[PDB]
Design a binder for this molecule. Sequence first.
Ligand SMILES: COc1cc(-c2cn[nH]c2)ccc1C(=O)Nc1ccc2c(c1)CC[NH2+]CC2
Ligand SMILES: COc1cc(-c2cn[nH]c2)ccc1C(=O)Nc1ccc2c(c1)CC[NH2+]CC2
Lengths: 322, 316
Amino acid sequence: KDYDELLKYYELHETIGTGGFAKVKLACHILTGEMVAIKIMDKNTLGSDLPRIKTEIEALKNLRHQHICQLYHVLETANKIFMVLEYCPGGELFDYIISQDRLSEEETRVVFRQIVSAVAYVHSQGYAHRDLKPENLLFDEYHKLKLIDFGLCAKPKGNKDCGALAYAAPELIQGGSEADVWSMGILLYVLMCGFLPFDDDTAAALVAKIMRGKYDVPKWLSPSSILLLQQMLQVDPKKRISMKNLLNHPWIMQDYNYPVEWQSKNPFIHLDDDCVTELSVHHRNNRQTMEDLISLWQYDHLTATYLLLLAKKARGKPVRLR
Amino acid sequence: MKDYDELLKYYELHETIGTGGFAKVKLACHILTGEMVAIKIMDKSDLPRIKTEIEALKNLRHQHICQLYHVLETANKIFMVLEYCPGGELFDYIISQDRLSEEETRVVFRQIVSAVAYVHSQGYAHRDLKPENLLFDEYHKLKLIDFGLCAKGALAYAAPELIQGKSYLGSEADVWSMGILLYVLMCGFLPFDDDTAAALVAKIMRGKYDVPKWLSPSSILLLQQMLQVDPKKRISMKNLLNHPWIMQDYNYPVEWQSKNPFIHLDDDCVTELSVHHRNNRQTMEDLISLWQYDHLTATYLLLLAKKARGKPVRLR
Ligand SMILES: COc1cc(-c2cn[nH]c2)ccc1C(=O)Nc1ccc2c(c1)CC[NH2+]CC2
Ligand SMILES: COc1cc(-c2cn[nH]c2)ccc1C(=O)Nc1ccc2c(c1)CC[NH2+]CC2
């Protein structure tokens, strides 16, 4: 009874889940033929941490970006919440870092310009992620990074509602968007060094290192790398580099000579007309109210079919259902 | 990273297979033996539950229980090095096909029965038997997992006396759950199911269920012996092991006794660990016999499996 609605729309394959509450079940969307990943939560096993699932869904319903792992479809049965998500077979950025030694400056940049694109867009929409680390970034079948787990979340100019400690800003530990900038700075350091700037045996010694904020600057780090690191690793969050200045930073533009393009290429308001026409021939009605219907963004089957059609059109394969 | 330094002396890390807050599962290679392993990584979020499981798995050793090799505790993590189970959940198996045949469900059920009868012999009751908690190893052999709710779950699997406050448990509640499991294997869905949780409870108490046309009268008889609302009326484990349904095609009852020993030690393995350590031998055996669930416990038990798969009793 929990799978009857899900199985009208999706053919279920393997289990890259079998975690706690949330198993990932690789699956195929029947109409389009595109590969999806299905996050499965237990609506009466999840404890007092169902608010995290709801904070994530409501952030993912409002965020749309080339470097954010897309939500296609939400399904709620008796004891189960289902999230139909974008396909990421390439592993975590974490798995990437721990397989190789340390990355070169130009290799970290290629990566880091993608983290910056995503996190800058999050902040434009009034959100702050609050748990940026290399586990929470995944690689798609085209080697591009996707940001995941908005389980902790913002609206810092919104209504009243921590993460990994080695990534946590000083002001976070003692109680904005500037906390995320600190965490991108920790991320930048590990990519180039192969080790954290602050690490210890006990948690109480880790906190003391974050507050004092003194760190090692390895011999192989360039002076451009060092300068950007100290702008991002400011203990005072008012002294930390702004996103407007990060986007076009001299280290950030080496070998690219254009700034980070953060603005979304995945639209809410514009409707692709190849997709509207193919959905119209399938559902059998007029494109006028077809557009009106998609524009509700209910994150049902129609939202899943529209956005997956748009993903198939992006691949190169044709705009076709069955 | 300081949290991975101890682990990474012993294990080469692979695939990141399964997020979920505190509990993440990474695939790993044990460097000395070359044997594949699964690593459960806890973000040190109910840590009495992690500690009940480790404590139960340190004392349980069985061919149809997913083996613990090694426990590692760093600052912010707990690592459990567990048996390799690439074959998926029994759950995934059931939902891919429609329903299983009686003889296909017998092959599968006799393993569930072998494992659960051994759990109960050691003074334990699992309390969360369901098809998500039974995994297939690389030989298509079932391994029972998650002893986090065990005593010394899912409502559709919960016994009537469990729901309304016991007075008291424990082993007969497991028998009810094996009965729910038996039904789903043969039918392709539950004897008690509903849209709301409040309607599910009411169905479990009255205990009346549909008996599909394709279920044999042997299947029906065993089902009603296991699905007794009164736990005193429910079939005993002594009678389950040699039940006529349990034996129909097999010339013999369920062998529940462990083939994985704590006390008796393999000499071929012992003499290979001795050449590595540059120990005498009486010391070597005395040391394994501590069962500390460190690297020496991981290396001994993985050497025992390498010995069993036909490859040589040799370290790398
Ligand atoms: C384990 O995750 C995946 C594996 C494969 C895959 C593996 N092999 N081939 C494909 C493909 C995709 C995923 C995936 O997208 N998972 C995912 C998406 C969002 C979130 C999570 C996971 C973590 C839980 N918290 C919410 C955020
Ligand atoms: C989540 O996976 C496991 C959990 C436990 C466990 C949990 N609790 N106690 C033991 C024990 C073993 C595993 C495991 O080994 N799974 C696994 C192995 C290989 C592969 C996969 C999974 C993904 C599917 N594709 C093939 C690759």
